[PDB]
Amino acid sequence: SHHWGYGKHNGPEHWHKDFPIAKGERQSPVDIDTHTAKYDPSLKPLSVSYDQATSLRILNNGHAFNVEFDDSQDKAVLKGGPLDGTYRLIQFHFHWGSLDGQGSEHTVDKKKYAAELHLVHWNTKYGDFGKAVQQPDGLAVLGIFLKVGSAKPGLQKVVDVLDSIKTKGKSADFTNFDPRGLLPESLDYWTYPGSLTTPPLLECVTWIVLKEPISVSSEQVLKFRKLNFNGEGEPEELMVDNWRPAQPLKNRQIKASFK
C-alpha cells in the first residue's frame, strides 16, 4: 500500500518514486500567467447545473475531506466551456495552508490563495469514474480560489460538521448540501489540460479554474486547520499545507474564457 502525504518525508518531492508520472508532461497544478493566457473566442459559455445535486456524506481520507455526491444519474453536471459532452459531479474537497498566505495549488502570477476548492466531475461517456480516470478527457475539475475576508454563508454547514470527522477514516452523513452556495458571481475561467494533483497523479483532467475567488472568514479557514491527517488515538498531525506546488507547464497553453 502507498504512504504518501505532505510532510518532509512523504511529500510532493518524494511522490515520483512510487508514481513516476509525477515528472510527466501534463502535471497539475500550474502557475497561471495571466499575461500569456490567451482569450479563446471558440470556448462555449460554461454550464454548471447543480439544481438536483444529492450530497450523501463527508469523509476525512487522511489527506483532505471529501463531500461525496450520488453520481448514479445526471443529477449535478458540468457542460460547455472547453468540454465535449456531460461531466457528472462525484465529490468536492479543498486544499489549504497553515497560514492565509499559502494553501492554493494553482497560483495566479505566482500569487498563492489561502485555499482552493476542487469540484470533481467525470465524463459520462466512460460509464464510471474508475474508467474515466484512464482517459485523457476523463475528468473535469472546477477550481475555485478562497481568500480570507467576509464569511461564505454557504460554506458554514461544511465548517460545522468538521468537529465530527477530525481524524482519518471518520465520516458523517452530509445530505441536502447545496454546492451552488460555494460559487462566486462570475464563471469567467482559465482552462488547460492536466492531472490529478495527488497520487496517482493521472493525466486525465481538463482543469477549469475560475478567475473570481470566493471570500471565506478567518474563523472558517481556522476550523479547516483543526482537522488531523492522523487516525484516532495517534499523535496529532494537523491537516494543513495539503497542497502540491506548481509543476512545469511544458508544451501547454492556458486559455481564458474572457478578455
Ligand X SMILES: COc1ccc(/C=C(/C(C)=O)C(=O)Nc2ccc(S(N)(=O)=O)cc2)cc1
Catalytic residue among 2, 63, 106, 121: 63
Stretch 115-154: interaction string toward ligand X, x if CB under 6 A:
---x-x------------x-------x-------------
Cα–Cα distance measured from residue 140 to residue 138, given in angstroms and rounded to the nearest whole number: 7
Per-residue DSSP letter, 135? S
Q: Strand 107-108 relative to strand 139-148: parallel, antiparallel, unpaired?
A: unpaired
User: Is residue 244 near Zn ion by the rule CB under 5 A?
Assistant: no
Q: Closer to ligand X by CB, 76 or 196: give it.
A: 196
Q: What is the CA radius of gyration of the chain?
A: 17
CB-based burial, 60-75: b 16+ in 10 Å, e otherwise = bbbbbbbbbbbbeeeb
Active site residue 121: no
Q: State which of positions 63-122 bind ligand X (CB under 6 A).
A: 66, 91, 118, 120
Q: Give the binding range for ligand X (CB under 6 A) out of 47-55, 160-168, 194-202, 251-259.
A: 194-202
In terms of DSSP H, where are the helices of the chain?
A: 129-132, 156-161, 218-224
Q: State which of positions 92-121 bind Zn ion (CB under 5 A).
A: 118
The residues of the shown chain that bind Zn ion, judged by CB under 5 A, are: 118
Binding site residues, ligand X, CB under 6 A: 61, 66, 91, 118, 120, 133, 141, 196-198, 200, 202
